[PDB]
Symmetry: D3
Subunit: 108 residues, 6 copies
């Protein structure tokens, strides 16, 4: 459809990248191996990925790790709660720098 058609195309672009520049795809594979090492469970790692995917505003990253979260057995409330946490942290960053603006106003 929209995401069910986008994700295979994104995975294909990564495959064409490895056939042309294998050291670049091997660099990402090294990043995924470092992430996979440790007792974290695949679903929790994918949920961590979705929270970062929506923060970086990467549509290809969203669909890849959302489909991987479902394959890992993540329910709908687990994802919505993960997104709600990422929204709170994205808003928390603006709260911190807004706090710096208020502190500057009182100081001048």
């Amino acid at each position: 459809n929209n995401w069910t058609e986008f994700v295979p195309a994104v995975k294909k672009a990564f495959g064409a990248l490895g056939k042309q520049h294998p050291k670049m795809l091997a660099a990402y594979g090294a990043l995924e191996e470092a992430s996979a090492e440790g007792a974290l469970d695949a679903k929790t790692r994918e949920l961590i990925s979705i929270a970062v995917a929506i923060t970086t505003r990467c549509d290809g990253c969203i669909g890849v790790h959302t489909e991987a979260a479902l394959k890992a057995g993540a329910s709908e409330a687990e994802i919505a709660q993960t997104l709600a946490t990422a929204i709170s942290l994205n808003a928390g960053a603006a709260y911190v720098y807004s706090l710096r603006a208020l502190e500057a106003y009182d100081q001048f």
Copy 2:
């Protein structure tokens, strides 16, 4: 203090670039010239400048345009409301891309 001393150091740094690379300082001066052309008052522009500064996480921009907003007659309630609006728009972005993840999960 901090902000009352950090802001002069920032403006002193921008003055240094004008001596070493005047073309780059003039380019910024061209950006503020276009930003000042219109019927929007100084307080309105400086409030907009603060909301973008906390979004860009630019501490120098925060202090420079917070002091400038005070010089334009901005009250503390106006800056806090400006920051509240900027905080809201930063979270709505995480909301928008969170909805994309939910639609992605619903389609797989």
Copy 3:
């Protein structure tokens, strides 16, 4: 394109989020309430909103608050000058960290 149909689609997506997860939509309602608290008129609130939206590069946020600023009485010149102000700040941030890099090129050597 098609901002006239994109904006109602974004609002509908927010509506389905509330009927499936009400505490997330209520949180955005609490954020929108604190943004309305104050003496800044609706036009200045939406102009500020558009400036953050183009800095964020959120398309749904841009169209929602551009239509709202229009209904609040914002002329095209007020919209353009708001973008010119947001673009200027979207360069001073790079200027500030460029000044750090030029200092970084000093000290060394």
Copy 4:
């Protein structure tokens, strides 16, 4: 340098915000309420919080939720593996947009 002094200072600034502007701190609490709803333990939520905090590069968000992760029982390897997952996704966004640049160069634009 001193996160044990930075984090309490950030917490004090948030508390002073609610005394001068309560609706702003209330909207923050509403975001925390929706975050703590859905049977995801605090350890998993704080680990997710760190992964987003380093993506936003907010030092206040990092130290606040790193301490909260320790209080929830997060091990050092649990955070390191979380950061390793967050780093992989930060590069993943760069890979996806670099693929757009290569597809652009092929079409000769």
Copy 5:
């Protein structure tokens, strides 16, 4: 993006801005003026421009400046290696702030 049609659409919109608000387009020209001044050739400048465009995630910026890299004589290997360097620095920024998180956890640990 990638399309040979989207890039002329971006350039046309920039010209429309200069017709309605010339002081805004002139400000961008002032920025491009300072970018063109210097010892770097056009290829290296457009390669640097591509690296920022994928970091700033601006599709039109990836557009305008990847074509200018082609016209400047940049090969596919020069485009790709620039992107591999840009990708490395993007992950590097996450590595740096991840170190702060590991340092903060060590100071709170008991």
Copy 6:
């Protein structure tokens, strides 16, 4: 940046490879793929600084500004790289501002 800040950053990277070696090996793979090709060390470090300005990473700035110096980068090459990165940073805001004015015209 400083002559003492960069050694502290590289010391933390080395320590990370001692407690979590797969994470440091992943960054090395990203550096090996970046070094592979005809682009000289100067252009790569200049590209690295321009990204280290778009991203607001100070450690990346000082590390790669020093590496650019050892690679033989001149002051004119450093400033022009920044002016190029500043132009692109403003260029991104110009594009999404064009969609904002395009949306405003559609709602009338």
